[PDB]
Structures are given as C-alpha cells and as structure tokens.
C-alpha cells in the first residue's frame, strides 16, 4: 500500500517565506527518495527540490538554490520543504512523490534520470501576491 499527502501551501505576500509537509502512509520515508513538483495551469511540472535515502544530501533547481531548502522527519514520517525569498513567479500547485531507492539501481546527482515517481498525490496550493 501507498499513499502521500501535501499540506502548508498558502498564500503570501512577495518577499515572504513558506513551509511544506509531504507526509506519507503504508511504506517509510527511510527507503525511499522524496520530490517537490510544481503545476502552473495548463504547464509542465517543475523538480524543486529531493532528498533520498542518505538524509546527508539533497537536490535543489538553479530557480531556488540559496532561498529553498529540503529536509525529512522519519519518526513524523514527512518531508518538509522551507521556502524564502518568494516571487510572484513562485505561485503554483505543490505536488510530491516518492521512488523505492533502496531497492532501485544507482541514483545519478540529478532530476532527470530514465526512472520515475507517478505515485499517489493531492497536492497544495501556493500564492505569492501582496
């Protein structure tokens, strides 16, 4: 069994900062890898940020690098993604997703490798306006 949920999107003003859950149910955060995506309406998704297996490291966008910053709880069983520096071109949908990385082969130092997550979702909504 899998299922995830996103939660702590909002609205806020530009310049602000904002905080993301992606909790999750029926496998743990600790074997797996964790993905921040964005949907703009009718748009593709953008990779924000990941963590995998090893909480030692994480992957972050050149859009986000030095204003976002990625981190997991797995007593919580949650991924929580910290946002600052907020642009009017930050609003979006906030989705997340997992991959089974202790089970997988090798993760590249990147977002767009062959593999990919389509798992469960409901996403949470954010907006950067004054």
């Known amino acids: 069994q899998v299922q995830l949920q996103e939660s702590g999107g909002g609205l806020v003003q530009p310049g602000g900062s904002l905080r993301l859950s992606c909790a999750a149910s029926?496998?743990?955060?600790?074997?797996?890898?964790i993905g921040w995506f964005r949907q703009a309406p009718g748009k593709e998704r953008e990779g924000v940020s990941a963590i995998s297996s090893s909480g030692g490291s994480t992957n972050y966008a050149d859009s986000v690098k030095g204003r976002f910053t990625i981190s997991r709880d797995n007593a919580k069983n949650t991924v929580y993604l910290q946002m600052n520096s907020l642009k009017p071109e930050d609003t979006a949908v906030y989705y997340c997703a997992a991959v089974d990385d202790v089970g997988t082969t090798v993760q590249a130092m990147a977002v767009h490798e062959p593999y990919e997550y389509d798992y469960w979702g409901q996403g949470t909504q954010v907006t950067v306006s004054s």
């Open positions: 029926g496998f743990t955060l600790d074997y797996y890898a």
